Amino acid sequence: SYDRAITVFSPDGHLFQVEYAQEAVKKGSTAVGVRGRDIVVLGVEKKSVAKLQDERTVRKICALDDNVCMAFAGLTADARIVINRARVECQSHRLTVEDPVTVEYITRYIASLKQRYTQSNGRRPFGISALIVGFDFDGTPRLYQTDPSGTYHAWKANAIGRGAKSVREFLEKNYTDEAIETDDLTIKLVIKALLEVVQSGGKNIELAVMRRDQSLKILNPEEIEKYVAEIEKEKEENE
């Protein structure tokens, strides 16, 4: 057994292996999510496809239950083992207390798994950040995120990945109340958001909405070809 303290304090009060892992998040591909009052909409950008690969084994939006979706950034090898440990826990909740898992509960499991893992012996911390999105019982759509140090944190709109400060500055000057008016109008905010990011001009973006009673339903590159037309068409006439 390898017993060595990896994460230790700095002489001024930092945890260096934590904040080095935050920079591995800061060059993964961008993931943006907002919530509507009835339909949540989150979609990663930079699919970065090379037209010789299977398109389904590269997906970064998975589901933990029927109601809880999840996107991430950072490095993918650490991601899909946190996900598989979350799938066991949200299934073991049902053998216990009968209701399906509330979206706040599954964030506390991931965040507490991630903290104690910056505390044990001989373990580097995880290098991912996540967005947990779900519409729980009694239909209240909400989302969260998870820092690699393990601080779960709710939001109304957020973005992580490479180029996340510029998108977060873009949303606050754009997030109104009437932006979440229609289920097709909230999507026009996300498609306007990631187009203000690394280019992804309809060819590298994959939105995925959830209408509070469905599962995840990814629109194929025909409505995004339709939406990016009309989002740029309104931009064509006003300016």
């Binding site: 057994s1 390898y2 017993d3 060595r4």
Partner: protein, 232 residues
């Protein structure tokens, strides 16, 4: 007590495992040894010079048998060899207690080289400093394999290990063909060990072991003197 539980063998920034590259340097500074298979059996021949006249040459042996039909020589450092001999003696027994059959020579090298790879990754150990040559005649056809400290293995027709091994491989390439008997391969194994020995190659400076379909055995210095006579 306890161990270290961390690998002291890491990747270089040029992408090379440096400790394995150093272990091959200790193999190349060993005693020269050649091995030749030819169509009915395998010949393993090595080069054993005592440092002075005080040593008892009939006490230790380079050529060792593993079972009824598998022999094994080396070219490296001494005390590492006796460890993985006693390991390979045991591995041939757990195959036999399960299957009630002498082990194939291929499946032994599957399991001896798995020990050497496992030993160059685990915590707190330096790799072995020996390379092996393994013979045997399973199901008529003979076999001749060579392992290395990294844990890989090969299937040679004829090869040389030890000092001046790059000169022996050029010498065997101009000598070996498909069609030789066992007593011809003995004569050309002495002819390639004469490239690097001293002036006197007597009946006790070398050590030769053969396989047949009758099984592995090791030559006594009586007929080794007869093969050393009328040579070169």
């Amino acid at each position: 007590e306890r161990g270290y539980s961390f690998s002291l063998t890491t990747f270089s920034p040029s992408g090379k495992l440096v400790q394995i590259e150093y272990a091959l340097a200790a193999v190349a500074g060993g005693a020269p040894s050649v091995g030749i298979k030819a169509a009915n059996g395998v010949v393993l021949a090595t080069e054993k010079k005592q440092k002075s006249i005080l040593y008892d040459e009939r006490s230790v042996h380079k050529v060792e048998p593993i079972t009824k039909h598998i022999g094994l020589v080396y070219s490296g450092m001494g005390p590492d060899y006796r460890v993985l001999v006693h390991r390979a003696r045991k591995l041939a027994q757990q195959y036999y207690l399960v299957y009630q059959e002498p082990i194939p020579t291929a499946q032994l090298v599957q399991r001896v080289a798995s020990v050497m790879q496992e030993y160059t990754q685990s915590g707190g150990v330096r790799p072995f400093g020996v390379s092996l040559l393994i013979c045997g005649w399973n199901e008529g056809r003979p076999y001749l394999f060579q392992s290395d400290p990294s844990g890989a293995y090969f299937a040679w027709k004829a090869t040389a290990m030890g000092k001046n091994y790059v000169n022996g491989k050029t010498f065997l390439e101009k000598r070996y063909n498909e069609d030789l008997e066992l007593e011809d391969a003995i004569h050309t194994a002495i002819l390639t060990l004469k490239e690097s020995f001293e002036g006197q190659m007597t009946e006790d400076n070398i050590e030769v072991g053969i396989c047949n379909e009758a099984g592995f055995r090791r030559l006594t210095p009586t007929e080794v003197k007869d093969y050393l006579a009328a040579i070169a």
